[PDB]
Curated annotation (Swiss-Prot), chain B:
It comes from the Archaea. One of its GO terms (cellular component) is cytosol. GO terms for biological process: GMP biosynthetic process. ATP binds at residues 29-35. Gene3D superfamilies: 3.30.300.10, HUPs. It comes from Methanocaldococcus jannaschii (strain ATCC 43067 / DSM 2661 / JAL-1 / JCM 10045 / NBRC 100440). Residues 2-174 form the GMPS ATP-PPase domain. The lineage of its organism: Archaea, Methanobacteriati, Methanobacteriota, Methanomada group, Methanococci. It is an enzyme of class 6 (ligase). NCBIfam families: guaA_Cterm, PRK00074.1. It catalyses: XMP + L-glutamine + ATP + H2O = GMP + L-glutamate + AMP + diphosphate + 2 H(+). This is GMP synthase [glutamine-hydrolyzing] subunit B. The gene is guaAB. Catalyzes the synthesis of GMP from XMP.
Length: 296, 298
């Protein structure tokens, strides 16, 4: 794979497919979407509008990171929607994982379609990677956009090589995949502000320590989950946090590798010392199969 | 340097004299302390000792059968076994408070034991009280004279006394086990389904830890059924129970820590649990030292 070649080629292919129309892209902060947004911006400048929807379920500091990288550094038109209270209010009382997924997917695409209308987008750019067993698209309230997918034939490692070349920050280039529903499926039972806070801070500790250990390039994913069961501490009851770390090619199968004991111990103690209301930290030692990667 | 052989002749002589012709009773927990006091006492007064094993259904897999073979068959003690499984399970229906679990189990055990105490007109309560590292009144009002042959020994001495008395290694070196048993290793309600998971999980843990020769280097190694659920793939996302593995070293009552366990052993225990015990979605390993955690999960 020649990243220099591919960029030149792909910038040219997009400009001609998109021609002079207005395009839109959802920035997750992940690598695939970040790479496609930057390729597209190179191809069409201010015709591109990027949208960041702050669902309140994102990793700590995402909004700022996306602003500083895409708006400040790179100069993309960037629309940011602070939708935290809206997504939290909607999840009040919801414990069914599938109801969480449906609610969050719906609010998300509704806000996205709203912005796409406001700006009269005609093209949707997505960072979809290969393969394609998984072209216009109709959005749920009827708006139709032509789809461009410049990474549609690329794999994980090719795209990491691309983001390097395009000068994206290291935090993006090696960003682990993160779900649409974000932290809401890493907080079992009800997504309260209390449990969401614990979740967000535990995940920041996991990310920081895994980065210090240079395991961010080897691991597929590495995260913390707030379980909806409690255990005892020094005798008071509080939240159990589970750590989840796996290797995988694509998320189809997964194995828990040998994680240095020191690293796990250090995470554990940072979590119980720095985050009030956590009694216990445990580590998931279940492969996929028979487990799924996420806990719900 | 403590002398087991001498202690046995001095103790057996002292037990005979404190007890006399009278009927004595003891609770067998399956632990080393009560096991030793029972055997000493049985050398002193033979058939005047009644040993009681209450099968609460909350003990480790195979416990009743090991007590039978060891104390009735091998040593010839008068053993009564009360099958109280249904009784303890029925009493814990709906009970999710850990304090209340502990209370219910404590008092119900006393009620079964006291019933036997009355039945057989016992006068003396032998206990396995040892040193830190006498009448009692039962609930209905029966009074027992307490005899504590081991009150002065430390755990290390008791263990030496137990080898000399012919007890198996399975008793002598067994990790300590809570009075309320598997009840405090099933979080939330103790249902029959969760308990059965807890029992087999613990048997898998004990077996694998022994096979890897780590029983020596660990204080406690057990499984807990958490009252929360995670996803598992079977065909097209099932919800099932999370089991947690707890392995600690500890040198005093204030502290414990999680040592480095070989990862192959962890993965082995994990893969056995999920493949062999229906309705477990995930196995997690506790990486919290004491402080800030406790050893048990509740
Ligand atoms: O965008 C997403 N929305 C979701 O609802 C969702 N659920 C799981 N995942 C991710 O997919 C992979 C497979 O996850 P599981 O083994 O938990 O099914 C893992 O990499 C998970 O993070 C999701 N991504
Ligand atoms: O006989 C008992 N009845 C109980 O209710 C009980 N709770 C905890 N333990 C045992 O005591 C030690 C310290 O327990 P924690 O660190 O969990 O507080 C550990 O070795 C525990 O196994 C119990 N033993």
């Amino acid at each position: 794979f020649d990243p220099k070649k591919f960029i030149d080629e792909a910038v040219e292919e997009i400009k001609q497919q998109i021609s002079d129309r207005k395009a839109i892209i959802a920035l997750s902060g992940g690598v695939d979407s970040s790479v496609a947004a930057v390729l597209t911006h190179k191809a069409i400048g201010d015709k591109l509008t990027a949208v960041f929807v702050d669902t309140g379920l994102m990793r700590k500091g995402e909004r700022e990171e996306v602003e500083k990288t895409f708006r400040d550094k790179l100069g993309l038109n960037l629309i940011v929607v602070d939708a935290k209270d809206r997504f939290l209010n909607a999840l009040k009382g919801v414990t069914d994982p599938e109801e969480k997924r449906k609610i969050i997917g719906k609010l998300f695409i509704d806000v996205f379609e709203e912005i796409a209308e406001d700006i009269k987008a005609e093209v949707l750019v997505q960072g979809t990677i290969a393969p394609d067993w998984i072209h216009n698209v109709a959005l749920p309230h009827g708006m139709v956009l032509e789809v461009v997918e410049p990474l549609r034939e690329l794999y994980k490692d090719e795209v990491r090589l691309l983001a390097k070349e395009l000068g994206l920050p290291d935090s993006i280039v090696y960003r682990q995949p993160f779900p649409g529903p974000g932290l809401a499926v890493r907080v079992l039972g009800e997504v309260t502000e209390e449990k969401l806070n614990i979740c967000r801070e535990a995940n920041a500790i996991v990310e920081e320590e895994v980065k210090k250990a240079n395991l961010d390039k080897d691991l597929w994913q590495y995260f913390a989950v707030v379980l909806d069961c409690k255990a005892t501490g020094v005798r008071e009851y509080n939240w159990i946090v589970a750590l989840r770390m796996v290797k995988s090619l694509d998320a189809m199968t997964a194995h828990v590798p040998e994680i240095p004991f020191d690293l796990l111990k250090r995470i554990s103690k940072r979590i119980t010392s720095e985050i009030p209301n956590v009694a216990r930290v445990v580590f998931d030692i279940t492969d996929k199969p028979p487990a799924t990667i996420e806990f719900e």
